[PDB]
Enzyme design. Structure first.
Site, PDB file in Angstrom:
ATOM      1  N   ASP A  35       0.386  -1.055  -0.211  1.00  0.00           N
ATOM      2  CA  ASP A  35       0.621   0.184  -0.057  1.00  0.00           C
ATOM      3  C   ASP A  35       0.820   1.434  -0.088  1.00  0.00           C
ATOM      4  OD1 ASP A  35      -1.796   1.952   0.203  1.00  0.00           O
ATOM      5  OD2 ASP A  35      -2.246   0.915   2.449  1.00  0.00           O
ATOM      6  N   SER A 198      -0.645  16.022 -11.335  1.00  0.00           N
ATOM      7  CA  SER A 198      -1.007  16.394 -13.161  1.00  0.00           C
ATOM      8  C   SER A 198      -1.070  17.279 -14.242  1.00  0.00           C
ATOM      9  CB  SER A 198      -2.385  15.031 -13.409  1.00  0.00           C
ATOM     10  OG  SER A 198      -2.155  14.543 -14.624  1.00  0.00           O
TER      11      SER A 198
END
Lengths: 329, 6
Positions: A35, A198
């Site tokens: 994770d 992004s």
């Protein structure tokens, strides 16, 4: 040194991925969920309340190398409301042939109902920054942080499969596992995550919109969670898609041929095939399917989970200034 | 689906 281990989907929907981990002397093999959105290595154990165990357990009294960390305790909760807590050992831990001595292994006294109900997951191995670890009074280092002194390079890579096996590598970049070149982008550690921005997005064969999207790279989250206006633009191009209040997101006919979704990494572009955005039927045999792209408004942060990451070869660069790399594959 | 820390 280096390590290389195979990672497998737990079920037919790619809900989560499991990787073998060797703990103790002689080795005890458990299947853990790796994770990148958390920083605790915790396991089902001989200490876990018996009615809450359905999993392979770690027994510290059978390991000649286990040491109790005196006075230490832990307690964690996740974005889906699941939780666990207990006490702390140090022991020898190996992943794919890479051995670390003195790793903190958090032994569960109790686990929540969703952990009991999932037979395939024996615990979690966290790979976010060590500032998110829940051990008190003194926080403990991740497996990656403890390995960096011996590794050939301070890096690990994630190569997750679409309904298929994949690989986690430690200490090297396999140049045969991707196409083109890797593009790197800046990471912020202010909240303890692999957090990045992004440069924008496109739906199908339409135009790329330059709009900053702040989010985290999280191998422990199934779906792709993005801003409400971005998610609405995607499902506007799917003629049967609607938001369902009772199911809890966008649903669409299973027979649709879905558009791709592209996200920006600097000047580079990663393309998620439309089939990856079909998560699957709402129940076996249904005509309706659940979408793999959903609104982040209820979380408060955007999440690049497995739907996005399985479309790329992803480099987690843990040098003193960390960076994140993406390549097509 | 899972949503791994809060």
């Amino acid at each position: 040194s280096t390590g290389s281990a195979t990672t497998t989907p737990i079920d037919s929907l790619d809900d989560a991925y499991i990787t073998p981990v060797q703990i103790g002397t002689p080795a005890q093999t458990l299947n853990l969920d790796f994770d990148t959105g958390s920083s605790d290595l915790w396991v089902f154990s001989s200490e876990t309340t018996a009615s809450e165990v359905x999993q392979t357990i770690y027994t510290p009294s059978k390991s000649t190398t286990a040491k109790l960390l005196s006075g230490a305790t832990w307690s964690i909760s996740y974005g889906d409301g699941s939780s666990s807590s207990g006490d702390v050992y140090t022991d020898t831990v190996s992943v794919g042939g890479l051995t670390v001595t003195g790793q903190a292994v958090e032994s569960a006294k109790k686990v929540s109902s969703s952990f009991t109900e999932d037979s395939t997951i024996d615990g979690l191995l966290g790979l976010a920054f060590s500032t998110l670890n829940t051990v008190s009074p003194t926080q403990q280092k991740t497996f990656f942080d403890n390995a960096k002194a011996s590794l050939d390079s301070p890096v690990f890579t994630a190569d997750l499969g679409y309904h298929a096996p994949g690989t986690y590598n430690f200490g090297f970049i396999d140049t045969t596992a991707y196409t083109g070149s890797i593009t790197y982008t800046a990471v912020s550690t202010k909240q303890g995550f692999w957090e990045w921005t992004s440069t924008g997005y496109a739906v199908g064969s339409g135009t790329f919109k330059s709009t900053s999207i702040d989010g985290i790279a999280d191998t422990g989250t199934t779906l792709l969670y993005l801003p409400a206006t971005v998610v609405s633009a995607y499902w506007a191009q799917v003629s049967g898609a609607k938001s369902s209040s009772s199911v809890g997101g966008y649903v669409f006919p299973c027979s649709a041929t879905l558009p791709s979704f592209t996200f920006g990494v600097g000047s580079a572009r990663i393309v998620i095939p439309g089939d990856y955005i079909d998560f699957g039927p709402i129940s076996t045999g249904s005509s309706s399917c659940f979408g793999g792209i959903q609104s982040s408004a209820g979380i408060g942060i955007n999440i690049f989970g497995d739907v996005a990451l399985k479309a790329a070869f992803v480099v987690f660069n843990g040098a003193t200034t960390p960076t994140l790399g993406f390549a097509s594959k | 689906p899972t949503e791994x820390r809060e």
